[PDB]
Design a protein around this ligand. Structure first.
Ligand SMILES: [K+]
Ligand SMILES: [K+]
Ligand SMILES: [K+]
Ligand SMILES: [Mg+2]
Ligand SMILES: [Mg+2]
Ligand SMILES: [Mg+2]
Ligand SMILES: [Mg+2]
Ligand SMILES: [Mg+2]
Ligand SMILES: [Mg+2]
Ligand SMILES: [Mg+2]
Ligand SMILES: [Mg+2]
Ligand SMILES: [Mg+2]
Lengths: 102, 291, 120, 25
RNA sequence: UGAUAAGAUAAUAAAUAUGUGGUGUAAACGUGAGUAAUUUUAUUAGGAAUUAAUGAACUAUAGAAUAAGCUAAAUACUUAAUAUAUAAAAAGGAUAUAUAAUAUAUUUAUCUAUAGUCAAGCCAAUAAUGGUU
RNA sequence: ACAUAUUAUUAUCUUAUUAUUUAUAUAAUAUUUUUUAAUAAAUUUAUUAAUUUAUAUUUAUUUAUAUCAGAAAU
């Protein structure tokens, strides 16, 4: 669509890549701190630039959020419980309660 | 062994009892269930040995905390640590939140200033925890005869010992102190005298809402000389002896009031045989100032 | 979508050529299990328009067959449409803007053609 | 035993009916 | 706020799902061992006992949401209060505004009742491989 | 013949667990109930630990019946 305007929290692409997170700060060299490139490159261009599937989809989702004045704060992917996934929690917990508290 | 050590053990046993779980209380404190406890083999928290029977706990004496207060070393955090643990209990434990009396807070504030030398951190634990007392249905502890007067008295000594003369800090602190009072029942009338003395000392005109004028009504201990009845009566009126002696010594304007001197005569002559409370306190303030 | 009775798409056709049944189904049954009722069909691939037609102004058409009366009954008894089915019903004029969401709310987008009910 | 008392009760009932058939026939 | 800084309170911005809680796994997926039918399959414009104070979870409407205890605390749990012979309940949170914790407003949840929708239990009739060595 | 494996059955033996049903406790908890100390507050009351009292809910043991399974026989 159109190119949104830089804000004070997100002055440049590098700040944009740091707020969204998910290790997207490792693509700062792909974009070259060019504001227009971040808001013009679609999936096909990003795929040609070596951005992997998960990251390019995530960036495009946050680019759409920014264009619509919606928060771009990092949301973390889910993680299994400390005691393991539900299917292996009973076994893990039994072996963790006999090696920590006896 | 010492009076302080024994009092602390009694106070720590009382808290452990009321912090124990209700389901487990009958099996850990009723000696008839000692064998039922063993069989259950409940595991003491902290992964320690299974819980063992304890001697039944009975209501604690209010004098127990007065003994601990006056045992704390000259520069120690023991009183500040006990209070923080005692007032961290749930507000559902009525025995814990009703043991504290107006006398205890007066003795915690007078000991901290003249003996333990950590007044600032004792007036912050009391100011910080006042909200919990209200939720725990014990607001009376924050009154005018034990909390406000004792505070203004310690202020009339720190402002001198330290020479503080700012007329803005003093008024702000005086306003906060009055705002912290939840049981505003002026009886002795010494509060008005104490507030006026502060203003003269720090050169400001006090003005607090609700502190209506009260004539002096100092309790006169009778000439009769009993034993534990007059030792308790003196200890009961010990706080107002520290306030009468303070008022006269700080400012000579209070010498005008002759009611103050009658109580000094009565309280001093009541047990003049023993040492002086006022002087004993001031000596320690110097023994703490030197450090 | 919530509830026990949902209006959703069941997939038919072949690999790489999906077609869908619009069905009323129990939430817990398999997507392609025999539903309560088959309300219609959805062909997601638009009909291709020729070069001339494109310049002529023809827009590709996606074709939906639907029992309008029966669909309204199931909405009446509290059946809950899926997001994709919701979009279809709003375009058909059965559902209104009350079923729109914040992400798809076309509050400000120009209308080039207004919904037209005809006979054919 | 409870199972030996149930067995005998049923065995007597079956034998009374087998005799009943002979008396009816 | 605390006369010296340990703490407390509020606002704001984050962190924590190795603590207590909620919902989710009777489905779907896979398989064909058992099963020859008091049980399983199929069928019928079949039936009654003439099927619960059951809603499972959405829809429509109406009303309600109280007091203690227990836990560190709660939308946890327990005991009570009041609600269609009568019986049988519940829960707050978020955000604003005004007050001196309370009240409204918005938003999302809780409970009950009535009907709908989805969905259950039971029975009959008829049919369902080989051997009477 | 028979040595094996599998399954079923029982007027038999042993039996986990569970359900149901007995008897018992100076059994535990709550409330009630009879008193009794200790402690506390106030100047009788409360609390805790005991005892008496019934009540409900549990627990331990115990009686009987049924029961996974195994044994023996067929
Ligand atoms: K498979
Ligand atoms: K099979
Ligand atoms: K609300
Ligand atoms: Mg939802
Ligand atoms: Mg958890
Ligand atoms: Mg299943
Ligand atoms: Mg309520
Ligand atoms: Mg509560
Ligand atoms: Mg609940
Ligand atoms: Mg209830
Ligand atoms: Mg033959
Ligand atoms: Mg058997």
């Amino acid at each position: 669509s159109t190119i949104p305007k830089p804000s004070d929290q997100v002055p440049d692409v590098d700040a944009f890549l740091n707020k969204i997170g998910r290790n997207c700060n490792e693509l700062k060299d792909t974009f070259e701190n060019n504001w227009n490139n971040l808001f013009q490159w679609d999936s096909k261009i990003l795929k040609e630039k070596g951005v992997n599937i998960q990251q390019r989809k995530y960036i495009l989702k946050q680019v759409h959020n920014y264009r619509n004045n919606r928060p771009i704060h990092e949301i973390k992917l889910g993680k299994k419980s400390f005691f393991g996934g539900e299917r292996k929690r009973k076994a893990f917990t039994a072996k963790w309660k006999a090696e920590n508290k006896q | 062994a010492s009076t302080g050590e024994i009092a602390k053990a009694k106070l720590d046993e009382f808290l452990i009892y009321h912090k124990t779980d209700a389901k487990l209380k009958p099996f850990i404190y009723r000696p008839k269930n000692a064998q039922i406890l063993l069989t259950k083999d409940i595991r003491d928290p902290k992964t320690r040995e299974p819980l063992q029977p304890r001697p039944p706990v009975k209501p604690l004496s209010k004098q127990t905390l007065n003994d601990f207060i006056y045992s704390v070393e000259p520069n120690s955090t023991e009183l500040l640590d006990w209070f923080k643990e005692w007032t961290g209990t749930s507000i559902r434990k009525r025995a814990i939140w009703t043991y504290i009396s107006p006398i205890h807070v007066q003795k915690m504030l007078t000991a901290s200033f003249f003996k333990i030398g950590k007044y600032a951190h004792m007036v912050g634990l009391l100011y910080g925890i006042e909200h919990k007392f209200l939720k725990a249905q014990n607001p009376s502890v924050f009154d005018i005869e034990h909390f406000f007067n004792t505070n203004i008295m310690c202020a009339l000594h720190r402002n001198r010992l330290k020479d503080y003369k700012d007329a803005e800090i003093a008024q702000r602190k005086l306003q906060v102190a009055w705002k912290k009072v939840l049981n505003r029942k002026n009886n002795t009338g010494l509060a008005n005298i104490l507030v006026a003395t502060l203003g003269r000392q720090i050169g400001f005109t006090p003005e607090l809402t609700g502190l209506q004028p009260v004539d002096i009504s100092l309790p006169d201990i009778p000439n009769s000389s009993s034993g534990a009845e007059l030792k308790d009566l003196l200890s009961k009126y010990e706080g107002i002896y520290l306030i009468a002696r303070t008022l006269l010594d700080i400012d000579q304007h209070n010498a005008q009031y002759l009611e103050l001197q009658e109580f000094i005569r009565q309280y001093q002559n009541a047990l003049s045989e023993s040492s002086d409370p006022y002087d004993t306190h001031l000596k320690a303030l110097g023994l703490l100032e030197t450090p | 979508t919530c509830g026990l009775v949902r209006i959703r798409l069941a997939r038919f056709g072949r690999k790489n050529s999906p077609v869908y049944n619009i069905v009323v189904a129990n939430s817990r049954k398999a997507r392609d299990a025999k539903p309560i009722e088959v309300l219609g069909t959805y062909v997601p691939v638009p009909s291709p328009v020729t070069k001339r037609e494109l310049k002529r102004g023809v827009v590709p058409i996606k074709d939906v067959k639907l029992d309008f009366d029966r669909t309204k009954y199931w909405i009446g008894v509290g059946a809950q449409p899926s997001e994709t089915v919701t979009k279809l019903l709003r375009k058909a004029g059965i559902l209104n803007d009350a079923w729109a969401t914040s992400k798809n709310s076309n509050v400000n987008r120009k209308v080039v053609f207004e919904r037209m009910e005809t006979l054919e | 035993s409870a199972k030996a008392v149930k067995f005998l009760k049923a065995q007597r009932r079956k034998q009374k009916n087998e005799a009943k058939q002979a008396t009816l026939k």
